[PDB]
Ligand SMILES: NCc1ccc(Cn2ccc3cc(C(N)=O)cnc32)cc1
């Protein structure tokens with residue numbers, strides 16, 4: 001592999017999925033597409049269908065104890081995992097995406113971004129055998145408290161979020177642990193609604209302060225619990241107090 | 249439109265995205281692919297690139313007040329939105345995906361699933377003008393407290409999660425508000441690890457109770473805060489107490 005782009009901190013991400021072609025949504029488009037093309041980011045997929053030996057290529061199996069749903073068939077999933085780890089070498093941490101996992105947040109994205117090598121195991125049906133979690137999975141993660149039709153979109157979300165921490169991928173994110181300020185672009189006036197004059201002012205320091213005050217007001221009004229995790233700066237305590245006083 | 253599949257509660261979801269081909273990950277594969285093919289689910293995309301008039305088809309614009317990033321250019325995004333609403337008719341609620349939004353959870357998925365018609369607006373760059381949120385967006389939602397390279401994966405996650413609530417899409421999800429029990433499938437013994445005998449027992453009622461006890465133990469050990477939102481049943485208080493006593 002070759003090219004001119006500093007790829008010092010490049011990431012390799014293996015994927016186990018019955019729907020590998022879904023990952024085209026991240027590998028062929030936009031910033032993540034650029035990361036793949038410039039060898040900042042490598043996503044390599046294995047399909048458990050390819051690790052079957054029966055005529056029909058069965059990748060699901062019946063739960064012990066009855067139930068409504070299927071699970072991922074152990075042998076083809078176990079084999080796909082073992083092939084991904086052999087390709088990867090020492091180091092590669094294996095992640096199972098599931099709703100039973102550690103809740104992903106940006107802090108967790110930056111821990112996950114320290115790994116040079118991830119293997120993301122995508123579950124379909126009602127999930128995978130507990131013994132494979134025990135013996136093959138380093139960490140279980142959720143992207144959030146909702147149920148989806150498989151692990152692919154969780155895995156794609158994880159990939160995109162860690163890719164942003166790869167130096168060179170971007171061309172800030174929960175700046176200061178707060179929600180973002182309002183943004184404006186052209187035109188000056190839109191449906192009789194105008195851009196805050198301060199943003200037209202040219203004064204970078206009065207603009208820094210307006211954005212920070214707005215972030216604090218917006219975190220306060222919508223996600224108060226996010227303030228509780230922060231030791232606010234003296235400036236931040238002052239702008240928050242002010243925004244609260246202009247509310248009342 | 250035609251076919252034999254009861255589509256009583258069918259959903260129509262408009263999408264505004266500069267990368268419409270990303271939505272192929274949900275419309276051409278698996279359960280969501282089946283929903284689209286059987287007319288349970290319709291995803292229709294508009295690209296703001298198509299609503300440009302300049303030679304180069306500019307879809308980004310400079311923030312007022314300076315900054316590192318671009319925003320979505322207002323005119324082509326505003327026009328794409330207005331075309332999606334005209335196609336949709338009365339009713340269609342417009343959603344902006346962003347980290348500043350209401351946090352998605354399964355409860356929120358079932359509120360969102362009541363709409364027969366959604367329009368999902370996907371932001372790229374540092375986001376969209378505040379005046380369009382004011383005048384075009386009914387609701388702002390986050391899939392979680394992490395920053396991504398655009399709204400597409402959030403929008404795809406939202407679509408997949410609401411699709412599951414469309415009668416006929418599936419072939420339970422935070423059953424009882426708890427994490428899932430362990431599952432097992434073949435083989436009986438795997439790396440010297442065996443399936444809980446109870447799951448082999450045939451006794452449906454002793455199995456119901458083991459799964460529920462395990463859900464409560466697993467919610468307790470990993471997501472205690474999820475218990476606080478619940479009024480547990482008498483049976484649930486009893487199985488939780490027992491699991492806590494077998495821990496200590
Ligand atoms: N038996 C219950 C059941 C669990 C999981 C699924 C699908 N699914 C797979 C991986 C994953 C992650 C998430 C998330 N929140 O990360 C959600 N759904 C997921 C379906 C049924």
Ligand SMILES: NCc1ccc(Cn2ccc3cc(C(N)=O)cnc32)cc1
Pocket residue numbers: 172173180345346347370371372373374375389390391392393394395396397398399400402
């Ligand atoms: N200026 C800050 C900034 C905000 C948003 C993005 C990308 N992005 C668009 C929509 C969206 C939803 C989420 C989520 N959590 O739903 C995350 N990122 C998203 C990039 C920078």
